[PDB]
């Protein structure tokens, strides 16, 4: 957990050759102590101090661990820890070197690089995920009374069913 957060993204290419260095399972499974005993107590005590504080911490963790799942849902990336997008690296002005980024730069310094335009990227991504990609997919299966009738696409289908 967090075991190479100080490494460069090339030595934190090591982090995402493992489970993003165990970050997500540490997000949801560090609940296990307050999951193991909010209920092992059999005591009256007539009032509760943790009955609001622990509950607020718990539902705070849950809504934070659902906003990110919904944001991966909105960019077609739901399930996939590492996925690619149709949004290009745009006019976004931190254009620099590949062998500088993924060899000698930590994740935190990288966050300091692109601390601006991050909401620009987040607004930008769903645009190419939806506004044309979903509409192109809607163009796919509407008009083809000739979808049963396909003669020169069998080769891709055969390749595709094996690989």
């Amino acid at each position, epitope marked *: 957990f967090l075991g190479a957060a100080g490494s460069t993204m090339g030595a934190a290419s090591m982090t995402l050759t493992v489970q993003a260095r165990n970050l997500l399972s540490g997000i949801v499974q560090q609940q296990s102590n307050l999951l193991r005993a909010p209920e092992a107590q059999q005591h009256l005590l007539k009032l509760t101090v943790w009955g609001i504080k622990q509950l607020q911490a718990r539902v705070l963790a849950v809504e934070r661990y659902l906003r990110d799942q919904q944001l991966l849902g909105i960019w077609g990336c739901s399930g996939k820890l590492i996925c690619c997008t149709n949004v290009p690296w745009n006019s976004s002005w931190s254009n620099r070197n590949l062998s500088e980024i993924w060899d000698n730069m930590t994740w935190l310094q990288w966050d300091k690089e692109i601390s601006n335009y991050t909401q620009i990227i987040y607004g930008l991504l769903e645009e190419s995920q939806n506004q044309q990609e979903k509409n192109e997919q809607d163009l796919l299966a509407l008009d083809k009374w000739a979808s049963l009738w396909n*003669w020169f696409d069998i080769s891709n289908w055969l390749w595709y069913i094996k690989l």
Partner: antibody
Amino acid sequence: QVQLVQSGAEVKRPGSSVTVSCKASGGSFSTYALSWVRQAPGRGLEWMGGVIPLLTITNYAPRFQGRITITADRSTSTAYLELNSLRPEDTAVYYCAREGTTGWGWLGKPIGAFAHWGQGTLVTVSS
Amino acid sequence: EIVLTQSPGTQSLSPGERATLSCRASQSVGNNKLAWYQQRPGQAPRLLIYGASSRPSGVADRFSGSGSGTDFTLTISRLEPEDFAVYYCQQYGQSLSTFGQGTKVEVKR
């Protein structure tokens, strides 16, 4: 790369039938749509029809259907075309062409386009 | 049957001219499936742009296809002395197909 060494040009009596070969080399004889095209010696180009050797799917011509025969014999790894009724208006060059694939190889996802080709021989009848 | 009808005549352009062709058809090809076929007399008719948008590794970048639906478009920025030949496009959409009509590009004196 993918090499389609077509058999040579031929002379033959008119009114008879004709056979031509296209021996592939490299990539895969099967699992990719080998096909066949025409061009009259001076005209543009013209597609006729093909074959898929793993499932013998024959997708034939809009007009030459019934007179064309394409096979696929993977046990000696060739591909033959049999046309009939030789005539001065069957005179065209007959290129044998294979569908290509993505990446530099012969195994990945196909493209749908006649990428790799063969040398072609003019199939002209003799009087 | 989709009668593919490209329609510039002789593309009598100078060496170094934008080789833009008409490249249409009778009706719309399904799923924009079009391939782009350069051809020389006696040689192999060679693919340029598969799917009318993407180009394989090895084909020169000066070949460039565009358009969709019924009529596509090919532009070629630089005209080299070896590309002066006849150009066609061909559908891989509907189960029947036909090639381009024939547009010759040449050296212009």
